[PDB]
Every structure is written in C-alpha cells, then in structure tokens.
Amino acid sequence: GSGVINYSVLDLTAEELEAIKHQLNPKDNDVEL
C-alpha cells in the first residue's frame, strides 16, 4: 500500500522540457511505465 506522489508542474523550463523529450541519460533502470 505504498503512497503516490503528486507531480503537477506547468511552468517548466525549456532546458528541462527538452531534456525529457530527448530522454538522454535516463534514471529508470528497472520497472518502467
């Protein structure tokens, strides 16, 4: 019954947003959704 974190951000940075789009150097090594 692990809790879930609420991540709701709109004011994202260009450098941050671009980083996700590229998905370069990920962190999730196992169990990905």
Describe this structure in words.
The chain has 33 residues and is mainly alpha-helical. The protein contains one helix and no strands. It has one helix at 14-22. The longest helix is centred in the middle third of the chain and has 9 residues, at 14-22.
Quick recap:
By secondary structure, the protein is mostly helical.
Gross geometry: flat
Number of strands: 0
Topology pattern, helix = H, strand = E:
H
Please state the CA-atom Rg, rounded to the nearest Å: 13 Å
Q: Assembly type of the shown chains?
A: monomer
- Between the first and last Cα atoms, what is the distance in angstroms? 18 Å
Secondary structure category:
mainly alpha
Write the layout of secondary structure elements.
Layout: H1 14-22
List keywords for this structure.
Nucleoprotein, 33 residues, 1 helix, viral protein, STRUCTURE FROM CYANA Nuclear Magnetic Resonance Respiratory Syncytial Virus Nucleoprotein Nucleocapsid RNA dependent RNA polymerase Peptide Intrinsically disordered region, mainly alpha, 27% helix, flat
